[model samples]
Target: TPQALKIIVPYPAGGTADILPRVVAEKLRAQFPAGVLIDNRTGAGGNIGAEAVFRAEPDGNTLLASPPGPIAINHHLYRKMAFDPSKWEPVTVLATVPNVLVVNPRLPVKNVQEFIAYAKANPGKVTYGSQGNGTTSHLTASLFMQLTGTEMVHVPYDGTAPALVDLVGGQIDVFFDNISSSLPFHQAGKLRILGVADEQRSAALPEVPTFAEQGLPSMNAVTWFAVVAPPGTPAAKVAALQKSFAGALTQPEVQQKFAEQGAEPRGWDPARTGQFIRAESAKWDRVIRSANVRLDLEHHHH
Candidate 1:
């Protein structure tokens, strides 16, 4: 009997978490022929849906498609989380989306260098917004401020959509935004692109240089999406998913669509995905502890 795999996305519709899974699902459908369903079970900063998968049967039928927030950064940001990413079985990394440091067009700065100068002159007056407190966008901006010795007030929103809405309306000065959410505004010239938070320039915006090129090497942070099954899922099933997804990632149409969206296709197998998550978790643990971030959630882990 063919298994019915359910891919859980921990966000509402029309967001990256929701969109990426559907893209993968389309490819998975073709490969599996057994059918795969993409389900959105959003809430509690993505933990509610994630925990659903964590508590599901340890079969390959139930899987999760989430960003770094719930898996790598959440453990550090939240005092306690419902699920431990290390406890989940790795499937494969789908892609890594780079973030951009963007400011409202009203800002006096034209590029990253000028923005740094303006920020230094203004100091604490420069305020930035994020989707949420412990989200990757928040951490990226927080880490940038920490590394650059700049002080900016952080404004947290319910989600990226709201934050970006405020950013374009000039309610916020700057925001470290995911490419998927920020690209349209960037193209429309509503936001000024300061620099990219990736090692290399984004193919979607090749004209914009990386933060490393702008002299802020610590600004490198890429929010990754990966497939994870409940713990104790059979190794064979994990391998099958990895192989099938790898093929999906390499398909010319899939590659082109992802590139058009400003994401780089990541071809990490299940084992590599597990190793990457472990390293990222440790790194974020240090960042969260050093930053002294404590969430009000019930399930706290230190």
Candidate 2:
């Protein structure tokens, strides 16, 4: 029972989900006597990989590093999903990444107010892209429109990477993207960040005002990554993993690596993670249901 512990990542090899798992695995390996292994299982907007984790043994050896989409928001977006977060036991939260409201630099908008004015004037002519239909990015923009009384075409791509690529190429007008994906472009001057969608400015980009600061209360959204095990995981093992990962967050090398990717180290205890997930799940359910978002052909899997 001292071999490698498998941590499932619900995305492809190089994505936002992949980054945290690999980082945790490396730090876990060095910190724990037993090594940790990360397995990438991709399909169905993270459902396949999530299901894999759901079915894995409740023992501590098998764990999952999942984000808001698969664990908290999928139940709201999809009519039927394979597993639910309530059925899993929380280990600890690794980090929470704030989303940014970014636009094509050619859009001639200087800030959130200007962007809203332009969007209202252009109506459906202005377009925005997201990771996929029913995703946080998509819902965030949709909610913004509903709250601010603006209209813009919704363009959903297979993933945020491609959507961002097209945004940089001027194929899309604006989007809400994770800091990791949007920060580089903002620094490169390929995309203009109008504001962050959190209550406070990001430590990495303090110059960008928060949505509330820009007079938009409905734009607050942050994606978090946490480790979980199937329901009934032993308390001792869960505590062990939590303690180890909590220590890992303070490591200078670990913090530096995450910082380089525009992520901050947000360490949360197991109880806090559980409470946060439950609150977020409830919040998103209301948003998704009120929005009346429907599943597209690709996301039709039950």
Candidate 3:
């Protein structure tokens, strides 16, 4: 209903993309006189929902809650786009999550250093799995290889579950999955965690360490969640949304809820969010092109 502000999530429910924004929406209901809501629109690596928001009226009521896949990386990787992700009105960054390095125990690598050493020794013999072509999981691993001067065979799956299954079954050697997805398996002793792909240690797993400590500062890639509206959305309405969303996100319970979901509240302002997205787009451009990530996956939507 137009009575509630509708936020379109580019991916299906249960992913961090869906979880973080849903959290904000629950708290957001009280802030707006009408209300707040989230809608899951899955397709073309988040292009469908993004396109809906792209064509939506710029009244700030139709907002897009999404990850960088559609905004920063899709244009370079996809053959066709429903909408232009750049040249939009950014509201603010909702949250950020780090990706963790997980490897099949059969690979005999216990840490990032050993993993890199193993990959270097084996060269193209090592196999890595990604959610699919052009996904963050795929590019994060690509960036890892690019910076370390290593090589690994890439096996792109339709989705994370299938790839993770292969990794667990020893069909794949390494996977740079997000911490939230791989953490439970690591805790359960199913997968060996090397290091987080961020600068500092994760609060969720302080003992896990980071890639920087393992001599790979170039692997500093983390997925960010943010809010954006149509291109012509007014600055005042954007400011209002930013203020309210930031206010809801910073509340005590809301912050704790985010941590539980393995997310950190960012709430960066419009200018900062725009700047960060541009930088990320550039970064992914190099990673996608260097890895030669192109469309044509059997199932490209998620």
Instruction: Give all candidate RMSDs, comma-separated.
Output: 3.7, 3.0, 3.0
Candidate 2 clashes: the total is: 0
Candidate 1: worst 10 consecutive residues by lDDT?
A: 293-302
Better of 1 and 2 by lDDT: 1
Q: Show where candidate 2 strays beyond 4 Å.
A: 31-34, 260-262, 299-302
Question: TM-score per candidate, in order?
Answer: 0.89, 0.88, 0.85
The top-ranked prediction according to lDDT is 3
| Candidates, ranked, TM-score | 1, 2, 3
lDDT of 1 by residue, 30-113 (tens): 866778888887556677788999999987889989887777777776556677877889998888898889899999998888
Ordered by lDDT, highest first, the candidates read 3, 1, 2
The digit string of per-residue lDDT tens for model 2 on 1-302 reads 46678888876555566787687677778755677888887666667777988888888788889777777777776666667767888888888888788999999999999998998888789988876655678778777877788888777665566677788888888988788778878888989999888888887788889999989877888877788888888888888888888888888888887887767777787888889989988888877766655555443110
Residue 267 error, candidate 3, Å: 1.1
Model 3 spans with C-alpha error above 4 angstroms: 33-35, 105-107, 117-127, 131-133, 153-173, 289-292, 300-302
| Local error of candidate 3 at residue 88 (angstroms) | 1.7
Report the lDDT of model 2 for residue 197: 87
